[PDB]
Structures are given as C-alpha cells and as structure tokens.
Amino acid sequence: NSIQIGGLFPRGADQEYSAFRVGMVQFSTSEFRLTPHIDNLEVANSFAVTN
Amino acid sequence: LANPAVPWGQGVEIERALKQVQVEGLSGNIKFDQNGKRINYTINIMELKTN
Ligand SMILES: *[C@@H]1O[C@H](CO)[C@@H](O)[C@H](O)[C@H]1NC(C)=O
Q1: How far apart are CA B40 and CA B47, in angstroms?
Q2: With contact defined as beta carbons under 8 Å apart, do B32 and B21 qualify?
Q3: Are A11 and A42 in contact (CB under 8 A)?
Q4: How close is the nearest chain A Cα to the Cα of B22, in Å?
C-alpha cells in the first residue's frame, strides 16, 4: 500500500521539512504508507516550479 | 523542461541587439534601457471639449 506523493520545499525551509518528517513518523500506519519524493527549489521561480 | 536547462549563447546577443535599437514609429521615439522598459517617449495630454 505505497502511496506516491510529490512535495516541494523552498530552499532554506528547514523546520517545515522537519515537522513534515515528524508528521510522517507519528501518523504512519500499518494499513498504508506514504512515499514522498522531495525536491528543493526556488519557490519564487516559475520555471523551477513548473519543472 | 529538460533539467538542468541550458541556454543558447546567441540569445544574449539577440537581447542586446533588440535593446540597443532606436527608431521612429507610431508610438513616437522608440528606445529602451537595460531592463527593456521604454525611454524618451512622449505621452500627449488631451482634454475632451465641446468642439
Ligand atoms: C531619454 O530617456 C531617459 C529615460 O528617462 C532619460 O534618462 C534621458 O534623459 C532622456 N534623454 C533625453 C534627451 O530626453
């Protein structure tokens, strides 16, 4: 039950990704497991966001 | 979208070519600065009257 979910973290955002992982650990369940793919980028950049 | 994006060299030259142009047209004197905004233009101030 692997669920692929993409994610976008603006470079320089740390505590957000930290709380993200903590949320992944605490809310993890035997039924299904979320499988995030993290890619850091420039959030203001439209090209980067599109890519 | 191919990552990492690689730009063509010629582009910068074409940009410079476009920005360096000074011509006469329907908008009046046409010239641009380094950023591409209009410079040396003339905006006619008009008033609607009886005639
Ligand atoms: C042409 O426009 C630029 C941009 O405002 C200005 O700095 C410059 O003084 C202008 N030149 C003349 C001759 O009006």
Answers
A1: 23
A2: yes
A3: yes
A4: 31
